[PDB]
Design a protein around this ligand. Structure first.
Ligand SMILES: *[C@@H]1O[C@H](CO)[C@@H](O)[C@H](O)[C@H]1NC(C)=O
Ligand SMILES: *[C@@H]1O[C@H](CO)[C@@H](O)[C@H](O)[C@H]1NC(C)=O
Ligand SMILES: *[C@@H]1O[C@H](CO)[C@@H](O)[C@H](O)[C@H]1NC(C)=O
Ligand SMILES: *[C@@H]1O[C@H](CO)[C@@H](O)[C@H](O)[C@H]1NC(C)=O
Lengths: 431, 431, 431, 431
């Protein structure tokens, strides 16, 4: 039992599935995919701020007087195949998939009763995208997360509440709470990814009451996790796990379960038609951030943006499949692992540490030129074995008294290494 | 002061402007003008009943999966000129203009806060049609009426209330009452034309409370009139004036102020692109219904349907201008008139009676072949004068003792009569 | 046998069907119906001259960079019913119908082999409009005329010929002659209405050779008529009949068969969406021009403009049906008639004269106030009878020695006259 | 001087630029990019053969009656930046770029006088794509090739010629020859890539006369090359160089200059919106085919398909940039090289031979596991040096008397090799 206050809500232990999942896939999909230009913040940058480049794009691409709601019918999504998406996510090694159900534009990706003619069923796809994706993911035993944005940029009731100093709660009682309850009662989410909370306190958003209901009387009360974006000054302070800031890259080990959210497109979470090759994050950088995040006790949430036709572009597929290929070899050092006592060597070639049971995994991203890996932190016992995940056969190792351990790496010819950018050394019987 | 009950509300006397206005113009305009096929009931006939002809039209005219909300962006209304509309309505002799602010499709023709992205400001015209038309009409001193449909066919909250036996009032508190209050507080209507009430009792619609507020604390509390469509079994029983049934044609004189609503297009209140010439009501039939309605103490509300571009087609303009030309001659027998003691001769060639002050007007629609008009009802005094509105000069008349009065009509050559289908005889000093 | 020179071609007698037809209907239909703004000269006024109003219309109604060819796919014509058109034309009293097969825009309304992807079959309607209309008209025994514009404003080959001083004939051999031969060999026209000839001499257009082929070896060599627009300085000088100038209104009787072409819309031959009621020619003015044209030995060609959906608007239907109603009464004074020796009274109330056999018809457009019609021209014999077409029964008439004939008109009550704007007096046994 | 016959035309020596260019980029771009489904043969597969899948796609994606020409206005190409394209092609190492000016659909990508309203200037892009791309490529000193398809699937004149047994030449004189002359006189192509010739003999296509004019009196008569697709049975028999069959992979060394044309998308030369990652040719396979083609004395033409918006998708950019990165290291073994006397080792790990001057390059695609490369073919002299292109420093080598040469490869650690899939050994002073 939990009471509608933060000290009680924060005492709820997180279900173990989230910490054992490690890797997840983020999907930013909505009406902003129709312009597919700039970012998913298109509407705010165009009308909220009146940026000249967005106005020029609107002038040169659409008739005068074109409004954002006119994008609604053009969100056809006629090539949407949730089974293909789920197969790709399974091949990528993802253990959970978080889909944006409603972004700051206010367009719900499910038939919301309080979003009539501004949802995916009434206009655009004419489908229940949330339900179809959830069915496809549940058939493959992949955990489901629903991203929900609390605020809406131009919703009249939210604007009225903002004018009133957020003393009234017309928007919260009309749209926010009914939509959250509908999203929880149906589709039975495993994860809730809240957003759009930087403008109002948690008292206005009714976050504590909804969280108490979710933890007490909801159909998913047991195996559900939420992030920290439930109001002003609530980020990285209150909630299940801490997203804190976007693309969070902590230096030291945090004392709370956290998650890193990053996008393959470095300049937009939503799809961009004119994405350059230099705007796509490299597979070496993606695997590197994942290794650092898992080593520091965090979850890795990689974002892709589907097109307005419901397609995932081949470059995103290539990145995801490379991540999955790397994971098919090095998963036992990632999935259901916990941080070690050091988590990285401060004197070697970028070595990070994970631990599972009695096994210690050293994931290194740079192959030493001289062919011997130096590991100062591990303490060798008489039953120490080096494995080099992906290669059958033990490795030669010498324990220097004054210096650290020295592991003789297998000198493999080109086009024979198991992975291409990061390698894992497994140590058994090491303190 | 009025209480929220029908006996108190019905005791409010109607302001005299409505009874003195006589002639009004009805405007059915909305998203249904985009298909412009069948009727303004397109959405219900297509999805509510699944009529094969509407499905065939959708198949042959639009891509598969096309939804009604996809019509929203196509309601461009780029040729809308409210000043031209108001000038035409003034030329037609109309004293009040009633515009549909929101029909059963739920699309509001003003920026309604509770109709986000389903209003004329957010999608389609990108204008405030109600406000622009009201400004244009007020500049010309024409009374303004707002048509509001209580029900919406496919609104999720209305469907939920219908499923619950109309015991809940989610739709009323979410959409209906806020929209009515917004429509009254802004645009300050002179008339409220309610509709969409045949499915629910007046208790569900909160009609008595809204009417008490309108009559007590509203900005238009003095000079406002409402019709009788405020709930089930409320038509022709409760309200300001009685529309009763559409195209109401009573035989005897009603004891309550009433209004006849008729459409120039006999098969649709909304605009139809494939309107035939045989579907357009003739000017002789329009003038005839107006004369009968005014004689029987009623108001005449003639309906036109603008195109999705905001244009009134030349045939509707021709009908309205013919009605205005007839009124420029015979207005003093219509405007600010009251029914006489007979209201029609039961033995002559379709003669109807109006009265203003001491003057009695006999409007006849059939020119007698023999050239003498027989009037049994009037009682002639020694100061009796026959005028024949539109022609200067008295008329010869003989009072038969056993029979009635015989008026010698002016034998005019062709292309010399003032009007073309109905003529007015003015009698002064007649009991 | 005829030689390719004007003196030989002009000696061909016209088939009698054209002179006996009298009344015809002109149809201007094409891609210019899609903008439906300004006139059928939209493309030239917009790009040829760069008029600011057309550029403003393009800016406010279509995305930037929109070209005229982009109008092609929008010419859907999905409500085109040629049987309905032919029934309306039969009801209007039309004896021939002339349809624009290709205007100055170059868009052919039939599958022209030399107009690939710029014809009605390839884009837009996806139909053979010329063939369908011809089939519908031939089923009702209505004569068929094909309007063909020689020039095209922006065709590259025509522009090249114009640059070369019209010394080359690339456009004529590539487009003009093959299209004329295809239009004659198929659809077997009864009439050819040439246009677009004011820029080049008849030598450039190969007019004499095509006309010699048409009169010698064509499938319609016997019953075919052509107008006078076959080159520079060819109008009203060379050809079958003389259109001379548009809306030609001669004062005296011409010595050659001529035709008056006029449009119901006074400011456009093509359809205009924003047509005003004041822009529509009145039925009194239409009947008046027809009476004057037939009296002076001419044919009357009335023009209508269908919408881009293939619909004839109700106002055009009303005008045509009024003309047909007038003709159902006064046809025997029009069809297969010839001009008399006077053709109009120079001292009476606008009386025009036709003659058929021994019968002389006096069509008057103004009803005399005193009720007696004065006719100075006719010479009365002892077997003279006045008929007053539309009314059974002879008329009283007195022959003044010094003055002319005086006919006592029937004093009809209102709503009893046969026609409404023009009346015909039939005289038998009159010199 | 050359005469219009094949023995004279085939005797013309090819300019050296084509043989020294080696690597080129093919661009398939046109109206077929608008559907972006199936292949660039969309129109023929949909209407020519009536394949059920294409009909289903048309039914589910476009309104009924939609025609291929209706795709024309949708070819907006609003993100076309030829400078970016040329920069990418320069970065990819391409020495010539061949753009499709007109495919079998008949849509010309330049303002063709004989393709009015079916060209890129009149509809769609409203630009001269050929001219803009040519300007961008010429600024960077990249050779320009124009792909021209002789036949058009549904052009009426071509169909008429086919019906007549190709005895008439209406299509050739109306469209083919004028378009070829316009494409040569303007844009001054360096290469002509003919296609669409498998249906008619070279006599019908007038190929010999056009080629004699091109080689004698054209502005590009000196430095111009053409392929072998100039008529029936002309492929791989007549012309400048031999494309023979698409994706030609000869086993032995041909005796004539040839070119391999291959597409990154294995199932379409045109862009496909639903391209899968498995449909994209791998960079290892692309580099492998290029090495085999250059070794066997051929040119490598890699094809990409831009979107209807004028964009090259990031996966195509990645492939091209990987090819360019490989070439920045191994270019001196490719550019301006000639085949050696062996061209491949028949007993080693896929070694191919090129030669430049006195230097012999052995390009191997498989790294030997034991680290020593065996080369039987080369004959070692006392001044023999092994270089291993990309690595500074000679290599140890031992000449076995009975066996071949054995080169000690540099044992490089992972993430230190110059290339990733193919390596080049340079031998100096070797017979
Ligand atoms: C907040 O939640 C409480 C408890 O569930 C509820 O009673 C109240 O209606 C909610 N307030 C708003 C503004 O929705
Ligand atoms: C009905 O009106 C009353 C009195 O104004 C108000 O208190 C109540 O909220 C209304 N009920 C609904 C369902 O809107
Ligand atoms: C003109 O007609 C003549 C005679 O039919 C024909 O020989 C010639 O080809 C035509 N000229 C052009 C320019 O079409
Ligand atoms: C073929 O080329 C010859 C020589 O240039 C030319 O005279 C002839 O017109 C051409 N034939 C066709 C069918 O274009």
């Amino acid at each position: 039992r939990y009471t509608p206050d933060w000290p009680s809500l924060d005492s709820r232990p997180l279900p173990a599935w989230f910490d054992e999942a490690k890797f997840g896939v983020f999907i930013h999909w909505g009406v902003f995919s129709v312009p597919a230009w700039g970012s998913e913040w298109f509407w705010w940058h165009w009308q909220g701020e009146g940026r000249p480049q967005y106005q020029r794009f609107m002038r040169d691409n659409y008739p005068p007087g074109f409004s954002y709601a006119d994008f609604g019918p053009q969100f056809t999504a006629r090539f949407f195949h949730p089974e293909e998406w789920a197969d790709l996510f399974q091949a990528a090694g993802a253990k959970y998939v978080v889909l944006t159900t409603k972004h700051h534009e206010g367009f719900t990706n499910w038939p919301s009763p309080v979003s009539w003619n501004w949802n995916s069923k009434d206009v655009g796809p004419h489908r229940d995208l949330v339900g179809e994706l959830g069915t496809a993911l549940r058939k493959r035993n992949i955990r489901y997360g629903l991203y929900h944005s609390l605020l809406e940029w131009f919703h009249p009731l939210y604007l009225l509440d903002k004018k009133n100093g957020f003393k009234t709660q017309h928007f919260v009682s009309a749209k926010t709470m009914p939509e959250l309850y509908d999203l929880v009662n149906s589709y039975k989410p495993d994860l809730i990814w809240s957003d759009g909370e930087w403008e109002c306190p948690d008292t206005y958003w009714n976050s504590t009451n909804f969280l108490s209901w979710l933890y007490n009387d909801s159909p998913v009360k047991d195996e559900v996790v939420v992030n920290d974006r439930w109001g002003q000054n609530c980020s990285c302070h209150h909630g299940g796990y801490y997203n804190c800031e976007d693309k969070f890259k902590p230096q030291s080990l945090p004392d709370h379960k956290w998650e890193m959210c990053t996008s393959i497109d470095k300049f937009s979470w939503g799809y961009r038609r004119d994405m350059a090759l230099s705007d796509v994050t490299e597979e070496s950088e993606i695997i590197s951030e994942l290794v650092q995040t898992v080593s520091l006790g965090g979850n890795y949430l990689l974002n892709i943006g589907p097109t307005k036709d419901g397609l995932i572009v081949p470059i995103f597929q290539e990145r995801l499949l490379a991540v999955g290929k790397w994971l098919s070899i090095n998963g036992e050092a990632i999935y259901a692992s916990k941080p070690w006592r050091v988590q990285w060597e401060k004197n070697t070639t970028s070595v990070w540490y994970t631990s599972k049971g009695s096994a210690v995994y050293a994931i290194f991203l740079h192959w030493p030129e001289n062919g011997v890996l130096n590991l100062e932190s591990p303490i060798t016992t008489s039953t120490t074995k080096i494995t080099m995940l992906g290669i059958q056969g033990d490795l030669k190792w010498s324990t220097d008294p004054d210096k650290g351990l020295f592991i003789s790496l297998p000198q493999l010819p080109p086009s024979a290494v198991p992975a291409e950018f990061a390698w894992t050394i497994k140590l058994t019987g090491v303190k």
